[PDB]
Write a protein that binds this ligand. Structure first.
Ligand code: HEM
Ligand code: HEM
Ligand SMILES: *[C@@H]1O[C@H](CO)[C@@H](O[C@@H]2O[C@H](CO)[C@@H](O)[C@H](O)[C@H]2NC(C)=O)[C@H](O)[C@H]1NC(C)=O
Ligand SMILES: *[C@@H]1O[C@H](CO)[C@@H](O[C@@H]2O[C@H](CO)[C@@H](O)[C@H](O)[C@H]2NC(C)=O)[C@H](O)[C@H]1NC(C)=O
Ligand SMILES: COc1ccc2c(c1)c(CC(=O)O)c(C)n2C(=O)c1ccc(I)cc1
Ligand SMILES: COc1ccc2c(c1)c(CC(=O)O)c(C)n2C(=O)c1ccc(I)cc1
Ligand SMILES: *[C@@H]1O[C@H](CO)[C@@H](O)[C@H](O)[C@H]1NC(C)=O
Ligand SMILES: *[C@@H]1O[C@H](CO)[C@@H](O)[C@H](O)[C@H]1NC(C)=O
Ligand SMILES: *[C@@H]1O[C@H](CO)[C@@H](O)[C@H](O)[C@H]1NC(C)=O
Ligand SMILES: *[C@@H]1O[C@H](CO)[C@@H](O)[C@H](O)[C@H]1NC(C)=O
Lengths: 551, 551
C-alpha cells in the first residue's frame, strides 16, 4: 500500500516515494529531523511548548475592552498587527506548490494560472480508503449528510451582530477570486489574477473590460434610471451575463462578474462600486487635465483596489474576528519583513469560504418581507428601491451564524451537497490533517469537534473515524467559540489564506506603495481613508444606516 | 512643453504631471528630498560619497589572482557573492512597473504578461526632440550610423578568450526569454515565463510541449541518425518551425524554439539538452519505479532548470566578467535577504543583450572553413559532423570583442539597424539617463564615452548632444575595460537585469529549494554539480575539448 497514504511525514515534511515499497520524508527547513520529521530542534521545541492555544488567544482579543483601548492608542497597535501579518502569512506557501494535477512542485503548476493551488497534496488514488488509511471504504452520502447536519431547522442568527450588508459584501468580494471554470471542471478558475484585482467590477479579461468602458474620462459606462446611476444594459455594453432565458438584454445590467445579475444584494454592491469608480475619475481629471482615458482609468482602478483592501481589512475583518484590537491596514508594517508580494487562490480556500449559512429565511425590506422566490432573479428590486433603501435594509437584518450545524436554508442547501462532492473529486485530505497543517491539534473524537453527544454519535457511525472526517463538514460542524460566528479551524485556516491574499497584492509592495501610483496625495488618501460609510454615502442622495453590524 | 521632458526628478523619483504646466516628483523612498529628489539623507550621502567606482572595482576583481585564491577558499566567497546578489538586484524593480503602453504603474501592466516591461518610462511623445529636450529634431539615420560605427572592418577577437561555444550558448539561452511577437509588434513577447523556464527546450505552450513529448518515461521524443540521438523530425512531432520554404518536414528537426533550425550552433545545443533531459529521466525512473510520465517529465525539467541556472552562473557568467572571484550559485545566500522570487523581461534588457558582434567572419570546423552562406540554414552539418566535432570546433574558435565599435559582420549588420529603429519605436530614453538609473555618472562628451577623438567627433555632429546619444549605440560604442569583452554600462546594466533574472526563478526560493523538489538527493546533486563538461560529455561517445574559453 502506498506508504504515503499513512501521511507519514509530520510538520510539512514531504512524503516522496522510492522504490516499490519505500518512502522518504523531506523535512527540509521544517524545524524537525528524523524519518518522519518528528524530532524538533531546541528552538522549535521552545517555540511550540510555549504557544498558547488559538483558543487562549481568541479569549484575550475578545476581552478587556479597556486594556485594549489603551493598547489601541499606543504604538503597540502596529506592533501586534505586524506580528499577526507576518506570522499568519507564513502558513501559506509562495511561490505556490501543488494543484489538482500535480502533487509535487513543477514548472507547470507554478506557471499554469488556470489551476487553483492547494496546500496539501491529494489523498493518493491508490489508498485503501477515500481518506487514506482510516474510515470506511464508502463515504457518507453527501445529500444525507447535508440534510442531517446542515439543513437549517430553526434560524440561528449570528451572535456577533453580522447583517446581510456584510453577507452580501462577502459574497461580492469573494466572487472576484473564486470563479470555478465549469467548462474545465473543479480545480480550474477563470479568475486568473487570484486575488483582489477588482475583476468582478472591470471584467476577467481585456475584451470585457473594453465593453464595460466608457472610453471617456476614465469612466465606466452606465445608465440613468429614476435620475440615478446604474450599471449599463447588456444592450449598451454587449457583455456576457448569466440571466435566465426569457430576459431581454434591455433588462439585464452588464457588470463584469456574469453571475452578479441573480441577486439584488450583488447588483447593489456592483452599483456602489461603479458609482465610486466614476467619482474618482472626476477627482483625478480635475487634478490632471493632461491625462487621458487610460491613465484616468488605470489610476482609478488602483485607487479602488486600495479602497477595497482597506475596508475589507479594517471593517470587514474586524467584524468577523470580534477582536478589540484595531486591525490596521498599513502596507509598511511589512516593509522590514521577508514577504512575497504574490498570491494564488487555493482550492481549500474556495471551500472554507463557502459560507452559505449566512443567508436568512426571507429578505426584509421595510414592512415588505420578500421570499427567496421573489428575491433571486429580481431584475426590478434595485431600481425600484434604490441603493439607500436596500443598504439600510440589509444593514438592519441579521445574518445567521456560520459555524455550529443545521443552519443552511433549504433553498440553497444543494450548494453544500455539491461542495462535499467536489471535495471528493479534488480528493482533499481529511479535516484532521488540515488541523495539523495549520498548527492545531487534531480532534480525538467527534464529541470534541462538535461540543456535544447527539450529532457526534451519528457522525461517528457515519464516518467511522474522526481521522476520516472530511474538510468542509469538519469546518461547519465544529463548535463555535463563545458568542462567535464560527470556530477555531475556520479562523486558524481562514485568516492565513485570507491575509496573505491581501497583503500580497502588488500594490502593497514598497515598489507600488507611493503617492504617485495613485495620481498623487488625493488618490493616495482616498486609499488611506476608505470607509464603508464613505463608500456608500458619497455615492447616494441620502446616507442610510450603513454598517457590517446590525444596529 | 511637457515638464517631464526635462527629466526633472533625480534618483528614481517619479515625474507626475499636474495641471497644464506643473509637475511633481515622487521621491518616495529614494533617499532624497526636494522638488527634484536631489537633497540626500545623511546616510545616502555617505553611502554614495564612499562608493568606489565600478571601474575601481572591476580592477580589483580582475587582479591579485593570489589574494583571490585565498579569499575563494575562505568563507568570504559566499559573503561577497551574497552582497553582489543583493546589491546588484536592487537595481531592478519587482513587482515590474511600466510597459510599452503604460508609463505608470497599473494593474494591466502588472498582469498582462505579453508585454516586456521597462525600467524607465518612454520619452513623452510631446517633447521638443526625440530624446526629450536635447539633440536634434531628427535622429541619425540608423542604416548610416550602423555602417559608420558598427560595421566590422577588421575582425577584433575578444581579448578574454571567449569562443563560439560561449557565443552559441548565449544565443540559445537568451532566446528562451527574448521572443518578440512579430504579430503584436515591439514591446510584446511570446515568452510568457519571462525567464529561465527552459521553454526553448519544451515549447512556449502546452500544445507544443505535448507534441514534443514521448509520453513515455518522462522522455522527450527524438530520432536516431548514425546511431546517434537527435531531435525528432517535424513529421514525428508536427510542431511549427521556421525553415525556409522548400525544406520538407522530414528534414526539419522539431525543437521548441521555432527559430532554432537556422544555425547548427543552435541546433547543437538543442541536441545536447534533449539528450540530457532523457538521460535524467532514466536516473529518475530507476529511483522511483512508481512514478508516471508526468512526474518523471516535470521533475526532469526542474533538474534541467537547475542545471542551466548553475552553468549559466558559474561558468557562463564567470567567463564574461573575467573576475577571479568564484561566483557561487547557491540559492541559500539569499534566504536571509528580502528578495522577490519573481521576474519580468525588460525591453532594455532585450536590447542590451543583442550581442551580434560576437559572430566571426567564417565558421571553422577543422580544416574546413565554412561561410555564412554555407552555415546559415544548413540542415545537414550537425548530423554530418555530430555533437563532439562541432563542440570541439566552437570551443576552439575565438569570438569577436563585443564592445568598442566596428566589429559586427556585414552579414548580420541589418539586425543592428533594426535594433536602433525599434529602440525609437519603443521611445527609449537617452543612454545618459540609463547611466544614471544604474548608478553611474553620465558622460560629459563623446570623447569620454569612446576612448578617442575620431569617432567621438563625428558622433558629436550626428547626435548634437551627448545627452541625446541613444541606448544601444551608447552601449556598443563606449570604451572597453582594459582587456575586456565590453565596458562599464554593459556590465552595470547587464548584471542587474541578469542576476535578478536568475536568482528570481521560483526554484531558488526556500519553498522549492528542497531535495524533494528534484526527486531526491540524486536530482538535487545533478543540479548542485551541473557543469559544461558533464553536460556535453555525459551525452557524447567521446569527450572533446569543451569550454567557454578558447584553449
Ligand atoms: C442568495 C444566497 C446565495 C446563493 C443563491 C448562493 C449560491 C451559490 C452556488 C449555486 C454556488 C456554486 C456551486 C454549485 O451549486 O454548483 C455558490 C458558490 C459560491 N458561493 Fe454562494 N450563494 C449565496 C450566498 C453566498 C454568500 C453569502 C457567500 C459567502 C461569501 C457565498 C460564497 C460562495 C463561494 C465561495 C462559492 C464558490 C465560488 C466558485 O466556485 O467560483 N455565496 N453559491
Ligand atoms: C549567425 C549569427 C546570428 C544571427 C544569424 C542572428 C540574427 C538575429 C536576428 C535576425 C534578430 C532579430 C531582429 C531582426 O533582424 O528583425 C536577432 C535577434 C536576437 N539575437 Fe541574434 N543573431 C546571431 C547571433 C546571436 C547571438 C550570438 C546573440 C547573442 C545572445 C544573439 C542575440 C540576439 C537577441 C537578444 C535577439 C533579440 C531576440 C528577440 O527579439 O526575440 N543573436 N538575431
Ligand atoms: C493549463 O492547464 C490546463 C490543464 O492541463 C490546460 O488545459 C488542457 O490543455 C490540453 C492541451 O491544450 C487539452 O487537451 C485539455 O482539453 C485542456 N483543457 C482542460 C480543461 O484540461 C491548459 O491549456 C493550460 N493552460 C496554459 C495557458 O498552459
Ligand atoms: C495584453 O495586452 C495586449 C495589448 O493591449 C492585448 O492585445 C490587444 O487586445 C485588444 C483587445 O483584445 C485588441 O484589439 C488588440 O488587437 C490586441 N492585440 C494587440 C497586439 O494589441 C492582449 O489581449 C492582452 N492580453 C491579455 C491576456 O490581457
Ligand atoms: C488582523 O489580521 C487578520 C485579517 C483577517 C482575519 C484575521 C486577522 C482573523 C483572525 C486573526 O487572524 O487574528 C480572521 C478571522 N480573519 C479573516 O478575515 C478571515 C478570513 C477567512 C475566513 I474562512 C475567516 C476569517
Ligand atoms: C556574481 O554575479 C554576477 C552574475 C552575472 C553577471 C555578473 C555578476 C557580472 C558582473 C558583476 O555583477 O560582478 C556580469 C558581467 N554578469 C553577467 O552575466 C552579465 C549579464 C548581462 C550582460 I548585457 C552582461 C553581463
Ligand atoms: C514513521 O511513520 C510510520 C507511519 O506512521 C511509522 O510506522 C514509523 O514507526 C515512523 N517511524 C518513526 C521513527 O516514527
Ligand atoms: C421583484 O421585487 C419587487 C419589489 O421591488 C416585487 O414587487 C416584485 O414582485 C418582485 N418580482 C418577483 C418576480 O418576485
Ligand atoms: C528642478 O528641476 C528643474 C528642471 O531641471 C529645474 O528648472 C529646477 O530649478 C529644479 N529645482 C531645483 C530646486 O533643483
Ligand atoms: C552544409 O554543411 C556541409 C558540411 O557538413 C557542407 O558540405 C554542405 O555543402 C553545406 N550545405 C550548404 C548548402 O552550404
Amino acid at each position: 500500500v502506498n506508504p504515503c497514504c499513512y501521511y507519514p511525514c509530520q510538520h510539512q515534511g514531504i512524503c516522496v516515494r522510492f522504490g516499490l515499497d519505500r518512502y522518504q520524508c523531506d523535512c527540509t527547513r521544517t524545524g524537525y529531523s528524523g524519518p518522519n520529521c518528528t524530532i524538533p530542534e531546541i528552538w522549535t521545541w521552545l517555540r511550540t511548548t510555549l504557544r498558547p492555544s488559538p483558543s487562549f488567544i481568541h479569549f484575550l482579543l475578545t476581552h478587556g475592552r479597556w486594556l485594549w483601548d489603551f493598547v489601541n492608542a499606543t504604538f503597540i497597535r502596529d506592533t501586534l498587527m505586524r506580528l499577526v501579518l507576518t506570522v499568519r502569512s507564513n502558513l501559506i506557501p509562495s511561490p505556490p506548490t501543488y494543484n489538482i494535477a500535480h502533487d509535487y512542485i513543477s514548472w507547470e503548476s507554478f506557471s499554469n494560472v488556470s489551476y487553483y493551488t492547494r496546500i496539501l497534496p491529494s489523498v493518493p488514488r491508490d489508498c485503501p480508503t477515500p481518506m487514506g488509511t482510516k474510515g470506511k471504504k464508502q463515504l457518507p452520502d453527501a445529500e444525507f449528510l447535508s440534510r442531517r447536519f446542515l439543513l437549517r431547522r430553526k434560524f440561528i442568527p449570528d451572535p456577533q451582530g453580522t447583517n446581510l450588508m456584510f453577507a452580501f459584501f462577502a459574497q461580492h468580494f469573494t466572487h472576484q477570486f473564486f470563479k470555478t471554470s465549469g467548462k474545465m471542471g473543479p480545480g480550474f478558475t477563470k479568475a486568473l489574477g487570484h486575488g483582489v484585482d477588482l475583476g468582478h467590477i472591470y471584467g476577467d479579461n481585456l475584451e470585457r473590460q473594453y465593453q464595460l468602458r466608457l472610453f471617456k474620462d476614465g469612466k465606466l459606462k452606465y445608465q440613468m434610471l429614476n435620475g440615478e446611476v446604474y450599471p449599463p444594459s447588456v444592450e449598451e455594453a454587449p457583455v456576457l451575463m448569466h440571466y435566465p432565458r426569457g430576459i431581454p438584454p434591455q433588462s439585464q445590467m452588464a457588470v463584469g462578474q456574469e453571475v452578479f445579475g441573480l441577486l439584488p444584494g450583488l447588483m447593489l454592491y456592483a452599483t456602489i462600486w461603479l458609482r465610486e469608480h466614476n467619482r474618482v475619475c472626476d477627482l483625478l481629471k480635475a487634478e490632471h487635465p493632461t491625462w487621458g482615458d487610460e491613465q484616468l482609468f488605470q489610476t482609478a482602478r488602483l485607487i479602488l483596489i486600495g479602497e477595497t483592501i482597506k475596508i475589507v481589512i479594517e471593517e470587514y475583518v474586524q467584524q468577523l474576528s470580534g477582536y478589540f484590537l484595531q486591525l490596521k491596514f498599513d502596507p509598511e508594517l511589512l516593509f522590514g519583513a521577508q514577504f512575497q508580494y504574490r498570491n494564488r487562490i487555493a482550492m481549500e480556500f474556495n471551500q472554507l469560504y463557502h459560507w452559505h449559512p449566512l443567508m436568512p429565511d426571507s429578505f426584509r425590506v421595510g414592512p415588505q418581507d420578500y421570499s427567496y422566490e421573489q428575491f433571486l432573479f429580481n431584475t426590478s428590486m434595485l431600481v425600484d428601491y434604490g441603493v439607500e433603501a436596500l443598504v439600510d435594509a440589509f444593514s438592519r437584518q441579521p445574518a445567521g451564524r456560520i459555524g455550529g450545524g443545521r443552519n443552511i436554508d433549504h433553498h440553497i442547501l444543494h450548494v453544500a451537497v455539491d461542495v462535499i462532492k467536489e471535495s471528493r473529486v479534488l480528493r482533499l485530505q481529511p479535516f484532521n490533517e488540515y488541523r495539523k497543517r495549520f498548527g492545531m491539534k487534531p480532534y480525538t473524537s467527534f464529541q470534541e469537534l462538535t461540543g456535544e453527544k447527539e450529532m457526534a454519535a451519528e457522525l461517528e457511525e457515519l464516518y467511522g473515524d474522526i481521522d476520516a472526517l472530511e474538510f468542509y463538514p469538519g469546518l461547519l460542524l465544529e463548535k463555535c467559540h463563545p458568542n462567535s460566528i464560527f470556530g477555531e479551524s475556520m479562523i486558524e485556516m481562514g485568516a492565513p489564506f485570507s491575509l496573505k491574499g491581501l497583503l500580497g497584492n502588488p500594490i502593497c509592495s514598497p515598489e507600488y506603495w507611493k503617492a504617485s501610483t495613485f495620481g498623487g496625495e488625493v488618490g493616495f488618501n482616498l486609499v488611506k481613508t476608505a470607509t464603508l460609510k464613505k463608500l456608500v454615502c458619497l455615492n447616494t442622495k441620502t446616507c442610510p444606516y450603513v454598517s457590517f453590524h446590525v444596529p
